[PDB]
């Protein structure tokens, strides 16, 4: 089956009602810019940003010209028109609104409270999609805490139980409605839900996960901000997950959770293929079509790993546009992160930017020598990698935010597409190379093994391998004459 | 209020069937040895062993002649008339009973199953405890596993129950019926329940923690069997309790559980101490009145931390009785267990021992040069220690195994009582000495804190310290948006 392709479309409020095709300085990326190929590189466009009001139901920013937010939305539907597979999802939420201190945090946990509630919400969530044309339902809720995950659970599968009906209604069977979410990429957000990983992401076709954003200038120690695999020299992490809920022993904790531990794309995935329940098909990995960028720093290693200046404040604190060529910067008043368009025109600018590799994390990154600067992005290259490991670990596909920081001509979408779908691209002699990969192991990875049956009345020594009630279990010490599962001193080890 | 003092006495079925207090070839221990002297040292006599029958009910062995069992539990309470707090308990279960491989293992899986099978099994305890005279319950079942907690205790709770009602219906309000268990005094096995600690107590006046044989010739090492304090140079153990049932973060668990730590009394105390829950009154230090020998000692340090050759299996498989000077070894055919009074007999013999002290564990043992051989056991010396930390701790009192032991003056019961009760002693500069402490922090013994209050909206720094609820906690990473107890971010430090 085709590996899912799925690009943000963002648009803010003043853009939609001031929406014109001919003036950049107004729109700096309309929907024109999708031409017909693109429209076929895509399996779905994830429409945003829509939020929840203080009525709890879905709700456009109250700003929001209602029809020409229509016309935007369906210039985007007309696009199906050269994809039959195409996908308009609509996205509610993201961080402005929804992080824990953002404008419309409470509308998000108040909406899932009661069955009455999440009811409310489903269905404006339905009829939202119905009448502005939408194939889908995505809620970028950044991010539900410990107490507010069963509501969160409870309300996705409301809104799966009336997304179903209304494909059958619709008769869409061909094309049925769909549900997903961004998901944390970083341990530390994800450890807000992740004991409830299965339960999430039953009810959804996808769990879009956010691996980007790995490392920025909030740190005080440069890095890539979506490295595929670890690098030993760079930077390492507490591993938030072996605090989660999970109400696993020290030993279960211990093997699924090395600390410190390397942030990377591989880590994000392995870490939700640990869980039982969690298909890999439904695991998307998210993309950057940006690159974060970093002052002050120290030469020796590229940029890499260094010491920085950068501030970390939003909004970006001072005038100081100092990330050099970055025109893009200038119009958005921040010189921390520029869009791949811009960087590619960087470094085919003559700017003083060298193109760098890391082998290990199978990225690019920029260093400015003179400046002193380092930029970590992803490009076509980095893609060909987590293209290959998409399809090495049988995930559902890419997504990437977002399709107005492609270039003009969409190479980097176009790069995805090849990578998953063309007969002229061959990547079975592409090495994966060496970078650190995630070994823990938890439920959902247990290996297969193979041991004798556990006899009752025998007393094992440590270490001792029995087969039991489906699973494998090791001993922890000697002299062991209770049965596996029912005692503290059994590990299940495999399957 | 006065420490407990609670000795086992124990009888054998034969030596009941044949009892007679003028032979000690036939039962070495009979009740007359208990002189009034010793009476009023005691507040508790634990009579072994009753069991559990095939019908789920306590019961005496069916070999028992239930005159002879009449006339010796008559015996035992006459001892009432020289002490009017003192206590006939009766003890059902002990290892040969109830371990996993015992005899009537199942029986004690089976008694506390269902509503049904505990209330008849708590009412066959009251009927026994009332039909021979006995003042209260106990139950040694060594020991319930994760499963069948909740079942233990439903019984414990359903004893305790009609226990107090018996208690009124006799008017007994002075001095009221009784329900205690031997607990496990090492990780090992206390992690079967160690989790359901509070609801294991809570119906119980005592929980008697078996804090020895906490060495013996199935380790590979030599060690003392109840050292109070740890040596650095002594084996070290797997901390099980990092393994139960708890449901605790990595960061609880390794606060917790230290591992590995050393075996000890002191140990177990705290093990007990760091739940919540469990009152220290509660606690009861068990201490052993016989030695355990080793053979194959090597020297350098007085036969400790050595390897060895002694047998580790039950029944001592040989006719070697290679224990010099230990006549009772003989008689027992077991070279590997020496009573108090067997032991001193050889220290005043001339059989080539020397009495040896370890100032951390502060704990005797013997060394035979000659014949390579190593002996753990207590004495009135490390009793003091070991009474002033039951004092220190505020624990409930003492327990031993067993009053037979004891030499025919009483010395170690005498012991006991001095350093509890003689208005002419002082321990108030006995010097605990430097062995190590058990360290770790739980939800029971969390250190006093202040902190300033949380306050929500608040996004914190990765250590900041917050109090909330009644206690102070600490940041495990850094930005944290959300609220102690709502958060994996937050860590219980303090109050
Ligand atoms: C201050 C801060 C602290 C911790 C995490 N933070 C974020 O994770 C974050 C994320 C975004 C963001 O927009 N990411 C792109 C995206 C794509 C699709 C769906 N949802 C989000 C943003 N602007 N500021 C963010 N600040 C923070
Ligand atoms: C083979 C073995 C391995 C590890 C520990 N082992 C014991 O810890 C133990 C303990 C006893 C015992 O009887 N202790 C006396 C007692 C006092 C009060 C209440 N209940 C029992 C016994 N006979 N074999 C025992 N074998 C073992
Ligand atoms: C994913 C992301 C996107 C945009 C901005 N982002 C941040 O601006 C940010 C900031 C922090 C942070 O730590 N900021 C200050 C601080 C340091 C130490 C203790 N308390 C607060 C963090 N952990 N993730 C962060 N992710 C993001």
């Known amino acids: 089956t085709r590996k899912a392709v799925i690009g943000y479309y963002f648009i803010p409020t003043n853009q939609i009602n001031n929406y014109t095709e001919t003036d950049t300085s107004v729109v700096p990326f309309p929907v024109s810019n999708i031409t017909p190929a693109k429209a076929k590189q895509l399996t779905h466009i994830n429409f945003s940003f829509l939020d929840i009001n203080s ?24 696009l199906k028109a050269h994809n039959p ?73 409301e809104i799966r139980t009336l997304l179903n009906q209304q494909t059958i209604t619709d008769g869409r069977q061909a094309l049925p409605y769909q549900l997903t979410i961004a998901g944390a990429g970083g341990a530390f957000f994800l450890s807000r839900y992740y004991s409830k ?35 030993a020299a760079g930077p390492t992490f507490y591993n938030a997950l072996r605090e989660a809920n999970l109400g696993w022993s020290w030993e279960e904790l211990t093997r699924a959770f090395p600390s410190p531990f390397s942030l990377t794309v ?47 404040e939003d909004p970006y604190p001072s005038t100081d546009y100092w990330l050099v060529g970055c025109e893009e910067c ?22 003083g930017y060298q193109r760098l590799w890391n082998d290990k994390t199978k990225t690019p990154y920029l260093y400015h020598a003179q400046n002193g600067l380092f930029v970590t992005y992803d490009d076509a290259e980095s893609f060909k990698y987590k293209a290959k490991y998409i399809k090495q670990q049988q995930l559902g596909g890419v997504m990437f935010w977002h399709l107005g920081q492609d270039n003009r001509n969409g190479d980097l979408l176009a790069a995805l597409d090849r990578y998953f779908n063309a007969a002229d ?30 006899v009752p009345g025998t007393t094992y020594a440590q270490g001792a391998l029995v087969s039991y009630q489906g699973y494998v279990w090791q001993t922890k010490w000697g002299y062991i004459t209770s049965a596996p599962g029912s005692d503290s001193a059994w590990l299940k080890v495999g399957r």
């Open 425 to 454: 691209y061959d990547d079975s002699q592409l090495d994966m190379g060496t970078g650190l990969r995630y070994t823990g192991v938890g439920p959902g990875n247990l290996p297969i093994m193979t041991a004798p049956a556990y």
């Open 330 to 351: 200038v119009r958005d008043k921040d010189p921390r992160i520029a869009s791949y368009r811009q960087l590619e025109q960087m470094l085919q600018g003559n700017y």
């Open 55 to 78: 009525n709890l139901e879905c709700a456009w920013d109250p700003a929001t010209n209602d029809a020409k937010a229509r016309d935007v939305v369906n210039r985007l539907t007309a």
């Open 266 to 312: 591989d880590a994000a995935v392995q870490q939700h293929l640990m869980m039982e329940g969690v298909p890999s098909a439904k695991i998307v990995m998210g993309v950057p079509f940006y690159g974060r960028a970093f002052k002050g720093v120290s030469g020796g290693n590229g940029g890499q790993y260094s010491s920085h200046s950068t501030p970390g």
């Open 85 to 157: 597979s195409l996908r308009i999802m609509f996205s509610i939420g993201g961080w402005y609104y929804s992080n824990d201190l953002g404008v419309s945090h409470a509308n998000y946990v108040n909406a899932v409270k009661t069955p009455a509630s999440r009811a409310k919400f489903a269905q404006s969530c339905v009829r939202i999609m119905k009448d502005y044309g939408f194939d889908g339902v995505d809620i970028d809720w950044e991010y539900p805490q410990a107490a507010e995950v069963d509501g969160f659970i409870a309300a996705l599968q």
């Open 197 to 231: 990983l299965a339960q999430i992401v039953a009810p959804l076709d996808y769990i879009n996960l956010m691996t980007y954003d790995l490392a920025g200038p909030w740190e005080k120690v440069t890095n890539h901000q979506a490295a595929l695999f670890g690098d």
